[PDB]
Amino acid sequence: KGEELFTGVVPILIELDGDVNGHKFFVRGEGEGDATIGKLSLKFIATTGKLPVPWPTLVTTLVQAFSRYPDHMKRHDFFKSAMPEGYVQERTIYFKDDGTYKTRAEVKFHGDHLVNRIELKGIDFKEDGNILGHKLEYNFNSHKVYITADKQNNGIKANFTIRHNVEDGSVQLADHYQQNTPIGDVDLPDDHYLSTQTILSKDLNEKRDHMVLLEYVTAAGI
Ligand code: NI
Incomplete structure (x- = not known):
């Protein structure tokens, strides 16, 4: 079943098992996606208590199959085509002048739910940096995620740079390699x-x- 699984609203379960500079945490998320309009609506809970990192740094890690690919681009939608068996998503994320996240996730269908199960390891973060010092604004900017085929692995690669607003009006960059x-x-x-x-x-x-997270994603560039 390709795409067909994304007609109307699909319930979503997300789980993240995290470790940053040795600080462990677990995040559980629930909500819904409608890929026909490219909308996500989700609620995440830290079950281990207060996070050792700001929530915005986890957004990109916490289901690009919910992008709305318009008709003329539906032949380019890797994310849905891999369903229901799903795909593995791996990233290295470099926070400029600070630490790095390494992530590995399994995205697939379990029953009528799309499920994102993630492991995250964070290393070499500076206390007195924007992440461990919690200096990031509670908001999120809009970005372009650039995608290309990876024919050798029968998949895709992607690279983009997230801009995180900082308290003092500067910007904390996070370079994503996917x-x-x-x-x-x-x-x-x-x-x-x-x-x-x-x-x-x-x-x-x-x-x-x-x-609580609300997202709108559409594909373009063709
Ligand atoms: Ni510590």
Whole structure:
């Protein structure tokens, strides 16, 4: 089943097992996606208590199959074509003048849910840096995710740079290098990009440390 799985609203489960400079945390997320409009609506909870890192640094790690690929570009949608068996998503993320995240995730269908299970390791972060010092604004800018085919691994690669606003009005850059490979035996796409927009908010009833996330993503560049 390719794409067909993304007609209407699909419930989402996300789990992240994290370790940054030796500080462990676990994040669980739930919500919904509608790929026909490229919309995600999600709520994440840190079940281990307050996070050792700011929530915005985890957004990109925490289901690009929910991009809306317009009709003339549906032959380039690797993410959905790999479903339901799914794909492995791996990243190295370099925070400029600070530490790096290494991530590995399995994205696939379990029943009617799309499930993103993630392991994250963070190393060489500076206390007195923007991440461990929590100097990042609680918001998110809009970016372009540049995608190309990786024919040798039957998948794709991607690279983009996230701009995180800092308290003092400067910007903290996070360079993302990404690789996706299918879990089974897909649509391999011509060079294109995803245009991303994101809002980060709070559930006023929620006592636990958490993040509500609203995302709109569309493909373009063809
Ligand atoms: Ni420490």
